[PDB]
Design a binder for this molecule. Structure first.
Ligand code: MG
Ligand code: MG
Ligand code: MG
Ligand code: MG
Ligand code: MG
Ligand code: MG
Ligand code: MG
Ligand code: MG
Ligand code: MG
Ligand code: MG
Ligand code: MG
Ligand code: MG
Ligand code: MG
Ligand code: MG
Ligand code: MG
Ligand code: MG
Ligand code: MG
Ligand code: MG
Ligand code: MG
Ligand code: MG
Ligand code: MG
Ligand code: MG
Ligand code: MG
Ligand code: MG
Ligand code: MG
Ligand code: MG
Ligand code: MG
Ligand code: MG
Ligand code: MG
Ligand code: MG
Ligand code: MG
Ligand code: MG
Ligand code: MG
Ligand code: MG
Ligand code: MG
Ligand code: MG
Ligand code: MG
Ligand code: MG
Ligand code: MG
Ligand code: MG
Ligand code: MG
Ligand code: MG
Ligand code: MG
Ligand code: MG
Ligand code: MG
Ligand code: MG
Ligand code: MG
Ligand code: MG
Ligand code: MG
Ligand code: MG
Ligand code: MG
Ligand code: MG
Ligand code: MG
Ligand code: MG
Ligand code: MG
Ligand code: MG
Ligand code: MG
Ligand code: MG
Ligand code: MG
Ligand code: MG
Ligand code: MG
Ligand code: MG
Ligand code: MG
Ligand code: MG
Ligand code: MG
Lengths: 137, 204, 159
RNA sequence: GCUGAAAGCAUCUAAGCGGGAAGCCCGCCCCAAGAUGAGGCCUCCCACGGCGUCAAGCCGGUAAGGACCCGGGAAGACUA
RNA sequence: UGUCGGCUCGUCGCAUCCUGGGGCUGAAGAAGGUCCCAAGGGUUGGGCUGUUCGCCCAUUAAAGCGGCACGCGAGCUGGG
RNA sequence: GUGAGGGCGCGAGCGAUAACGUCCGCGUCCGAGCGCGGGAACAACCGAGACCGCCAGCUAAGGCCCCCAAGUCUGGGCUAA
């Protein structure tokens, strides 16, 4: 019978974001967000690595984007389709730009939301100096 | 950003120079500073202003410590005033000069479960030819299959009033420090006794 | 490029002269050579956008030089009766057919001059600047296309 | 409209830069941390007293403090 | 799957009636013509007819067009 | 038993070289294969005809960056919307 994994300790990770293509980054962030990279994978349990990203604003993006990209925020109210350009996001709370990205890439499942928590993002760097900090690229 | 608490005491009318002007009467007794919160200690600037005295026995709450923290007679109520760190230990009616305009926030009278017509001053319905079933009735609300639902916030009857209402640019009339009184341009939210705040309007 | 002091940086070039120093944002993929006491520039290829970029920097670099060399100055004519101008220290106030006297702020690095109530020069150290300042003036009261009024550069009459 | 090449000229643009709408973002007013991403501040009370070897819990008494009940309100269907 | 018009409540579109800005003009100025940008808000009372439609009176900054089962009869009316 | 058929490709009439239009013909699937893979979902388009089991193995269509299995494959060009 296929291997039956058990309780695994949260392996944290420290990832950069300077001059990084928004997408190309988020992909890995998601890939590694779930333990999909560890051969001992298991969809049921949800034991992904705690991914922390720094230097959010630094993120690079191609073509028009900055001026082109548009985000959709629909409140339940009439004409509440309030929409925001990319730049604006980088102005207000830039961290979002990557969040909503990874967010949209994690499985739609309820444990995916649980994986969203394993995702901490800021721009400084300077993370909440806890313990783990395995840098990567 | 001037800011002082008070209560609506009533309203009559005075005579400016040779003209009649309806005015409201507020009472801005001394409001002891309680906690000058700086951006360091919090993130915004403000001041906790106390108010009415208190039976020291009723305030047996930890409020005792908070009061003693600044060393003041146990007040009854206390709120904040964003962006306003003045001086001394108490604000007064001396803050406002006859001529300055102020913003006063109050608690509107509660009109209970009020009817649509009363609430949003609707039109109602025919009192004559039409069936005696829809006199004060919203009538229609939506469409057919599309969209099939109701636009969120659609004006409907219900509990209305008794909320936070802010009237603006009321000019400060004759202010008498001799009794902690303050006169304004009349129309002020809240009944005769409601806790209201008086700030600085935004003409420019 | 005589008596100049062109000093090259990564993505920009700092040029110094009698008038002073000025920064000029230089394109990325361009080689700002500094042969002898003069300056050269080449391009990484022979494509369309690169031709444009070269010629662009080509002059853009010559501008930084001339800017701290002999300086930049444009003229301004004025037609019409009341249409005149009174220099007030730095800023200049000129009534040109408005109930309110026009007060013109003096930006940094620019000092427009007034030899006559009609003629007004535009002293500066940057083409982009003098370019805007010159237009900013004509923008105040464009020429009357039916006769002669408003502020002109020095070009033909609108007739 | 500027500087400005492609394209020795020219050009408001292809790099960049400025001005410009009752519109947009903010500003004003109202709700609002069920913002389960549950934020922050100030102050008050503090030990287990006994089983559980562990881990996971329970129990009668307490503290700060709250609730019930009662008189009552420009608050209010009810409840709050 | 109740069918006009009316009432009530609206909300959305933009191909804009008004107010906003702008180009050209056979644009002196005023006033206007036409095209572009631009829904945020506004977009009257009345006579006749079941009417929609339209005609008319008086005014207006203007008295916009159209979608929502030509919106809305478990909201109303019932003249058609 | 059936005597409403339908979609589709192709060849024609009608239609307007219109219609998820219609009327014959040749074939095909659906019908009755709403069983499976692909196509986001989807009777008829692409793959392929389910006797039952299996925590084996190659492949079909499509696909091989994340939701998603499997290349951010390799080499050479084009396209800045
Ligand atoms: Mg740009
Ligand atoms: Mg920009
Ligand atoms: Mg709104
Ligand atoms: Mg499910
Ligand atoms: Mg009432
Ligand atoms: Mg009323
Ligand atoms: Mg009302
Ligand atoms: Mg209304
Ligand atoms: Mg009515
Ligand atoms: Mg009836
Ligand atoms: Mg009856
Ligand atoms: Mg009835
Ligand atoms: Mg209906
Ligand atoms: Mg040298
Ligand atoms: Mg040279
Ligand atoms: Mg010109
Ligand atoms: Mg040229
Ligand atoms: Mg030119
Ligand atoms: Mg031109
Ligand atoms: Mg072009
Ligand atoms: Mg504006
Ligand atoms: Mg404005
Ligand atoms: Mg808003
Ligand atoms: Mg014990
Ligand atoms: Mg426990
Ligand atoms: Mg109680
Ligand atoms: Mg209405
Ligand atoms: Mg609205
Ligand atoms: Mg106009
Ligand atoms: Mg015009
Ligand atoms: Mg003219
Ligand atoms: Mg004329
Ligand atoms: Mg709106
Ligand atoms: Mg009528
Ligand atoms: Mg009548
Ligand atoms: Mg009559
Ligand atoms: Mg009639
Ligand atoms: Mg009628
Ligand atoms: Mg007619
Ligand atoms: Mg008329
Ligand atoms: Mg409508
Ligand atoms: Mg209808
Ligand atoms: Mg109806
Ligand atoms: Mg009915
Ligand atoms: Mg009807
Ligand atoms: Mg109905
Ligand atoms: Mg009857
Ligand atoms: Mg009749
Ligand atoms: Mg009849
Ligand atoms: Mg038969
Ligand atoms: Mg045919
Ligand atoms: Mg048929
Ligand atoms: Mg057919
Ligand atoms: Mg057939
Ligand atoms: Mg079959
Ligand atoms: Mg068959
Ligand atoms: Mg078959
Ligand atoms: Mg079925
Ligand atoms: Mg499928
Ligand atoms: Mg299928
Ligand atoms: Mg078998
Ligand atoms: Mg295989
Ligand atoms: Mg293939
Ligand atoms: Mg895929
Ligand atoms: Mg390639």
């Amino acid at each position: 019978k296929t291997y039956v994994p058990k309780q695994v300790e949260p392996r944290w990770v420290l990832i950069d974001a300077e001059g990084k293509t928004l997408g190309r980054l988020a992909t890995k962030i998601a890939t590694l967000l779930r333990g999909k990279h560890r051969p001992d994978w298991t969809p049921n349990v949800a034991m992904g690595d705690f991914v922390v990203v720094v230097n959010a604003d630094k993120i690079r993006v191609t073509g028009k984007k900055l001026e082109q990209k548009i985000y959709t925020r629909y409140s339940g109210y009439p004409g509440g389709l309030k929409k925001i350009p990319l730049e604006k996001m980088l102005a207000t709370h830039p961290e979002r730009v990557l969040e909503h990205a990874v967010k949209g890439m994690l499985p739609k499942g309820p444990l995916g939301r649980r994986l969203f928590k394993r995702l901490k993002v800021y721009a400084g760097p300077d993370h909440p100096h806890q313990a783990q900090r395995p840098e990567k690229l | 950003m001037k800011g002082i608490l008070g209560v609506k005491v009533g309203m009559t009318r005075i005579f400016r120079d040779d003209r009649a002007v309806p005015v409201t009467v507020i009472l801005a007794g001394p409001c002891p500073v309680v906690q000058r919160r700086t951006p360091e200690k919090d993130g915004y600037t403000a001041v906790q202003l106390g108010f009415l005295p208190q039976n020291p026995k009723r305030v047996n709450r930890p409020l005792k410590g908070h009061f003693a923290k600044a060393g003041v007679e146990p007040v009854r109520i206390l709120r904040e005033i964003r962006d306003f760190n003045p001086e001394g230990d108490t604000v007064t009616v001396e803050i406002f000069k006859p001529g300055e305009r102020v913003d006063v926030t109050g608690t509107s009278k509660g009109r209970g479960f009020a009817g649509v017509m009363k609430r949003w001053n609707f039109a109602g319905g025919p009192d004559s030819h039409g069936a005696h079933k829809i006199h004060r009735h919203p009538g229609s609300i939506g469409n057919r299959k599309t969209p099939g639902r109701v636009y969120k916030g659609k004006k409907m009857a219900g509990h209305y009033g008794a909320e936070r209402v802010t009237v603006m640019n009321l000019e400060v009339v004759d202010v008498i420090p001799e009794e902690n009184l303050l006169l304004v341009k009349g129309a002020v939210p809240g009944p005769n006794g409601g806790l209201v705040i008086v700030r600085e309007t935004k003409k420019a | 490029p005589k008596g100049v002091s062109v000093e090259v940086a990564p993505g920009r070039v700092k040029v110094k002269g009698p008038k002073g120093e000025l920064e000029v944002p230089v394109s990325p993929e361009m080689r700002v050579v500094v042969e002898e006491g003069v300056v050269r520039v080449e391009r990484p290829s022979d494509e369309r956008r690169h031709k444009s970029l070269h010629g662009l920097t080509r002059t853009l670099i010559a501008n930084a030089v001339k800017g701290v060399s002999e300086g930049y100055s444009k003229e301004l004519l004025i037609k019409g009766i009341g249409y005149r101008a009174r220099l007030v220290g730095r800023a200049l106030e000129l009534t040109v057919g408005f109930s309110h006297p026009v007060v013109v702020e003096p930006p940094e690095g620019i000092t427009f001059e007034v030899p006559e109530p009609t003629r007004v020069r535009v002293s500066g150290i940057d083409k982009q600047k003098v370019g805007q300042v010159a237009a900013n003036i004509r923008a105040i009261r464009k020429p009357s296309a039916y006769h002669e009024k408003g502020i002109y550069y020095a070009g033909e009459p609108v007739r």
